[PDB]
Amino acid sequence: GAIKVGTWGGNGGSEWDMGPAYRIDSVKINAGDIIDAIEITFTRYGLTETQHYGGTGGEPHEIAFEDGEYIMSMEGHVVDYFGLTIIGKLTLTTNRRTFGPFGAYEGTPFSIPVAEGKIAGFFGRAGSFIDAIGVYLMPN
Amino acid sequence: AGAIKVGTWGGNGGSEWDMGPAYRIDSVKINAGDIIDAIEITFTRYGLTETQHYGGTGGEPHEIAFEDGEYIMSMEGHVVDYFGLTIIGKLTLTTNRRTFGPFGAYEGTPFSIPVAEGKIAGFFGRAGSFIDAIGVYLMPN
């Protein structure tokens, strides 16, 4: 019933799945050389929730979405990080702003620009880092 | 009408084209040599089956006729520099049963659309002599 695109990344870590949200309120990405973590605050069915995926490392970067602001694209790199296949660079683009790039490693690029509709949530794999990531797509 | 469109990947040249979403994709023909010259899709929507060709007249053709219950679940390829133009140099379509491609010989910046849940139901992009850019419509299964 859902539209899920991904994942991009490795087979390490544990599977995680935020599910789609009615509204994404804010995102925090922790990154150093690679993407350590992603945290999302979102609202659905009248309730707000915060979910954190990944480890404790990296410098934090946060965006609080404006009213009418939605995620239009995600892009990054799947990298080799000391033998691990993980997310090394990540950017989220909204209808108004660019959030990123964060991370310093490159490898195999991926990009998911949404010409019609929106990125409504995320899924992926994580342990100490973000091993893999994917998106839920919903109509606008 | 609540469509979900992802893309485009490719250059800014060529003229825009858009097949729209289809009820069923019947067949796809890709013409390729060094790069992706053309894509032709036969699809059904509202009791009508039609064929639309995008791109030029070059390259060798290859075709897939979809089986009953067969749907597209992935698209991947390369955005490349071809004599200074930025176009699609390699393309593959993967169904729940078969891999169609890869076609084309040039590499550059890879792109990939793995559909974990749902299907690719149509295409849009830019084209002139070749396929400058490509994108897809998505639907649930």
Numbering used by the authors:
A (entry chain A): 3 to 142
B (entry chain B): 2 to 142
What is the paper's account of this structure, in its own sentences?
A BLAST protein sequence alignment search revealed a candidate lectin from Musa acuminata ssp. malaccensis, which we term Malayasian banana lectin (Malay BanLec). Like BanLec, Malay BanLec has a β-prism-I fold characteristic of the jacalin-related lectin family. To assess binding of WT versus F84T to HIV, we conducted surface plasmon resonance analysis to determine the binding times to, and binding avidities for, the gp140 trimer, which is made up of uncleaved ectodomains of the gp160 HIV envelope glycoprotein trimer. The results show that F84T and WT Malay BanLec, which like BanLec exist as dimers with two CBS per monomer, bind with high avidity to the gp140 trimer. That is, we asked whether disruption of pi–pi stacking in a structurally related but distinct (only 63% identical at the amino acid level) jacalin-related lectin, Malaysian banana lectin (Malay BanLec), would reduce mitogenicity of the engineered lectin without abolishing antiviral activity.
Between the two CBS, as in wild-type (WT) BanLec, Malay BanLec has a tyrosine at position 83 (Y83), but instead of a histidine at position 84 as in WT BanLec, Malay BanLec has a phenylalanine (F84). First, we aligned the structure of WT Malay BanLec to that of WT BanLec. The structures are remarkably similar, with a root-mean-square deviation (RMSD) between all atoms of only 0.517 Å. However, the aromatic rings involved in pi–pi stacking are arranged in a planar (sandwich) conformation in BanLec, whereas they are arranged in an edge-on conformation in Malay BanLec. Malay BanLec treatment resulted in greater BrdU incorporation than did WT BanLec treatment at concentrations up to 10 nM, but less incorporation above that concentration, which may be due to cell death triggered by excessive mitogenic stimulation. These results indicate that Malay BanLec is indeed mitogenic, and highly so as it is even more stimulatory than WT BanLec. Therefore, Malay BanLec, like WT and H84T BanLec, does possess antiviral activity and perhaps has more potent activity against certain strains of HIV than does either WT or H84T BanLec. We would expect Y83 and F84 in Malay BanLec to interact via pi–pi stacking. Thus, although Malay BanLec is quite a different lectin than BanLec with only 63% amino acid identity (differing at 52 of 141 amino acids), it is predicted to have important structural features in common with BanLec that make it a suitable candidate to engineer in a similar fashion, with a view to reducing mitogenicity while retaining antiviral activity.
